[PDB]
Amino acid sequence: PVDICTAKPRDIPMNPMCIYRSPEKKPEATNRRVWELSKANSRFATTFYQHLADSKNDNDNIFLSPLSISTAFAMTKLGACNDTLQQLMEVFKFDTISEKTSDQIHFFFAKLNCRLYRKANKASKLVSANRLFGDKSLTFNETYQDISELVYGAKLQPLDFKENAEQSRAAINKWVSNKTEGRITDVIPSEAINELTVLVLVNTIYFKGLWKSKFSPENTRKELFYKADGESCSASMMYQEGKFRYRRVAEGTQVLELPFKGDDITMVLILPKPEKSLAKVEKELTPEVLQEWLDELEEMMLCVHMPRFRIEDGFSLKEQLQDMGLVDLFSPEKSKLPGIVADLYVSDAFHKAFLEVNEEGSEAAASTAVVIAGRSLNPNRVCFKANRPFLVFIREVPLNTIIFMGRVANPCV
Amino acid sequence: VDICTAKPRDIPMNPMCIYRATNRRVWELSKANSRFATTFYQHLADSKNDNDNIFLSPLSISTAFAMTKLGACNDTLQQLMEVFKFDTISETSDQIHFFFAKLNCRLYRKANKSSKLVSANRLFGDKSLTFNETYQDISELVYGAKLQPLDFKENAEQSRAAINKWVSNKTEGRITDVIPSEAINELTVLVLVNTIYFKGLWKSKFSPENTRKELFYKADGESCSASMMYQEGKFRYRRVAEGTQVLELPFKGDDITMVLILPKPEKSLAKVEKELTPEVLQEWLDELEEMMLVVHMPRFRIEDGFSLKEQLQDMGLVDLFSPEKSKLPGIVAEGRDDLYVSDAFHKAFLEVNEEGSEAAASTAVVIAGRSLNPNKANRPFLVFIREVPLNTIIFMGRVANPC
Ligand SMILES: *[C@@H]1O[C@H](CO)[C@@H](O[C@@H]2O[C@H](CO)[C@@H](O[C@H]3O[C@H](CO)[C@@H](O)[C@H](O)[C@@H]3O)[C@H](O)[C@H]2NC(C)=O)[C@H](O)[C@H]1NC(C)=O
Ligand SMILES: *[C@@H]1O[C@H](CO)[C@@H](O[C@@H]2O[C@H](CO)[C@@H](O)[C@H](O)[C@H]2NC(C)=O)[C@H](O)[C@H]1NC(C)=O
Ligand SMILES: *[C@H]1O[C@H](CO)[C@@H](O[C@@H]2O[C@H](CO)[C@@H](O)[C@H](O)[C@H]2NC(C)=O)[C@H](O)[C@H]1NC(C)=O
Ligand SMILES: *[C@@H]1O[C@H](CO)[C@@H](O)[C@H](O)[C@H]1NC(C)=O
Ligand SMILES: *[C@@H]1O[C@H](CO)[C@@H](O)[C@H](O)[C@H]1NC(C)=O
């Protein structure tokens, strides 16, 4: 047979002439390769997140799936070469995994992807909506497709851009929307794709989950949420008391982990103290700093106030991505995707992320009351009130993977 | 031949004294009992600290005093009727005992539900006294309480232990000292005793895998550990006035359910208890709508014991306790007819775990013994173990400390 979970480096053609070799640099029961990749992948998430945050206004929420983008450009990378391939490695930090080969990266995703989407449990409803779209006139390589299928679970789909340019756009949106249980409707904006369109990269991940420790709607109370602009608005502040992996870090910033049923996927909230600013924290937050904060998360009983929120971000990666160094892939001239063709470059890359958080969890709203008999909490107990902007992440703990990462700078409606 | 199957005018039951289908009375009885239950509970809490643990079988007390009533006469008989609210059952004194007997039948007599709810009533009289044949017969008829002789005159203490051991045997050792030492003395004539034992399986049991050790904070700043059980499922529930939560956890068979009452954390039982009445506890039950919810309740056990004298006197039962005014002539034929209740003791037990719940209780009315001078945490929650079809409160209390 040979599926994603049995794939061995031997089951992934190297393709000489097209292999990069990133420089050198001189805890588990968990797979090391997955460990290394997740670190390289989180390295890109925080980088990308920072650039993206800087380009945005503080009062704007944000939400994306860096794992998505990262995986999307990884399958694109599958058939990239030379200049194009290098930028792909360096931009997405895959080149930060010591002496690793552009070929091995794909083997790592094999391992990662195998566990993220297959070996996972029922509760870990994780759907990968990443596909490559190119015009029919182009002849695509079947070795690429076959590997892109095995590893990334998706082949490049040919669409009639030249002719049915607009008909294609709707074909794409119809497909992303299918996998995203309808949540990720439009994926490519209007007049985004046209006759000149050659290659289009779309990427999203869909997660559906229930809190392991639900909030009771009965305890939700409209509260003020202070924004960046110094103003205030009313949000539906959820409230509960429970045991959560928590941790007060540098300068009073609070890190809270709220797991979902399944236990492997959790939402981490980062709330700086009223004084310090989220922007200040977004800046200071680095891969190792974030990795550290998470390693220090210790179970603790606390009072949690959390605004109910909904965030939906529409991304056109191309700009920021090339602004970050990925220039060739988007270049009709400098581009080089020899493995994907049988002048091929990426026209644009679209990303859409969606998060709705309520008392039952992320995605759902099936009311549930909560009765806690015979509980007496310390009248001094530590509280976590998120009535000011805070970061958010959805990560697969065992895989040390950041699936989604966002910012809730305004939850109010 | 049988009090349960028999009928009013068909059974030869009719006490010495007296004072002013049938299921209307049986139901009026249960309401009287519940009314006594809630009233008595209030007086009981009223004398304790708002944060003291409290558990008891009000049904058990009513039964023991109903028994005592059989030999009561005049003022004492009237007071007994009024205090235990038997004076609200449209019917005379003698009558009551029939319905009560009917009630106990529809309560403890059944081979249905693994909802073990038994009860044993027994009399313990002085080995040398001559008890009234009629009293002794109605007692054994209506309440199934047989008279066991004991030497209170000479060797009393061994007798007090004799009784306590009998209650123990009747409640799976759960109640081990219903009667305090030194209460029964040489001049102790008789001891009326009731016992109730419950043991049910959660209709929707809790899994130990989900139970977790949590820290409880005693009001005094101190803190201890409390094993908390957890589970999600459909339950009749409701958040009432001032934010009080009422949860009904039925036992297998749905005939007996435990009703929890938790006031919003930023409030206390105080208001709830002072406003507690049968009608109220019923309104809440009538608001209970099934709902999907998460239940977090301590796997614990509490025991309580006490004298029913002070509070029962406060409630208006004074004569029965007055060595002078007490009137219990229908008890001893030859020996004495100056009997009075020295003291009334009660002891209840409640244990709750993943499997289910176990409650026991006993009440010991002591005739002419010694009136032994009346010999904790926070975030408490009320508990009731009721018999739904019969509308009776079997057990009830305030769990203030699950540690
Ligand atoms: C699609 O991509 C294919 C892989 O990148 C590519 O085929 C590759 O062709 C080269 C030579 O043209 C082979 O490289 C050398 O090794 C093989 C192995 O035995 C020899 O047979 C060759 O002669 C050569 O020395 C690659 O092995 C081969 N890749 C594989 C394993 O399939 C195609 O050219 C591209 N186009 C399509 C759709 O065929
Ligand atoms: C024992 O008690 C019974 C009643 O419990 C007594 O029986 C009769 O009770 C009626 C009450 O209406 C009196 O009018 C009778 O005089 C009582 N005796 C008769 C003639 O039946 C009985 O007196 C008591 N006897 C003992 C054992 O002391
Ligand atoms: C990118 O450029 C490199 C080198 O400039 C290409 O790889 C080698 O190119 C030289 C010059 O044509 C050849 O002599 C080698 O045989 C090539 N590789 C090998 C087999 O050693 C590379 O192919 C270019 N990228 C593509 C495929 O467009
Ligand atoms: C998406 O299409 C698949 C068939 O390939 C179907 O099973 C699934 O239910 C569809 N999603 C929606 C909109 O339910
Ligand atoms: C008590 O009741 C009896 C009849 O039950 C009656 O003869 C007597 O007058 C009453 N008074 C007292 C205090 O004995």
Swiss-Prot record, chain B:
Changing residue 143 to C: In AT3D; type-I and -II; Whitechapel. Changing residue 25 to H: In AT3D; type-II; Rouen-1/Padua-1/Bligny/Budapest-2; lack of heparin-binding properties. Changing residue 357 to R: In AT3D; type-I. Changing residue 92 to A: In AT3D; decreased antithrombin activity. CDD domains: serpinC1_AT3. Keywords: Blood coagulation, Disease variant, Disulfide bond, Glycoprotein, Hemostasis, Heparin-binding, Phosphoprotein, Protease inhibitor, Secreted, Serine protease inhibitor, Signal, Thrombophilia. Changing residue 164 to K: In AT3D; type-II; Glasgow-3. Changing residue 73 to R: In AT3D; type-I. Changing residue 103 to P: In AT3D; type-I. Disulfide bonds join 4-105, 17-73, 224-403. Changing residue 188 to I: In AT3D; type-I. Changing residue 41 to C: In AT3D; type-I. Changing residue 58 to T: In AT3D; type-I. Glycans are attached at residues 74, 112, 132, 169. It is found in: Secreted, Extracellular space. Changing residue 159 to F: In AT3D; type-I. GO terms for biological process: blood coagulation; regulation of blood coagulation. Changing residue 20 to C: In AT3D; type-II; Rouen-4; lack of heparin-binding properties. Changing residue 214 to K: In AT3D; type-II; Truro; increases affinity for heparin. It is linked to Antithrombin III deficiency: An important risk factor for hereditary thrombophilia, a hemostatic disorder characterized by a tendency to recurrent thrombosis. Antithrombin-III deficiency is classified into 4 types. Type I: characterized by a 50% decrease in antigenic and functional levels. Type II: has defects affecting the thrombin-binding domain. Type III: alteration of the heparin-binding domain. Plasma AT-III antigen levels are normal in type II and III. Type IV: consists of miscellaneous group of unclassifiable mutations. Forms protease inhibiting heterodimer with TMPRSS7. Belongs to the serpin family. This is Antithrombin-III. It comes from Homo sapiens (Human). The lineage of its organism: Eukaryota, Metazoa, Chordata, Craniata, Vertebrata. The gene is SERPINC1.
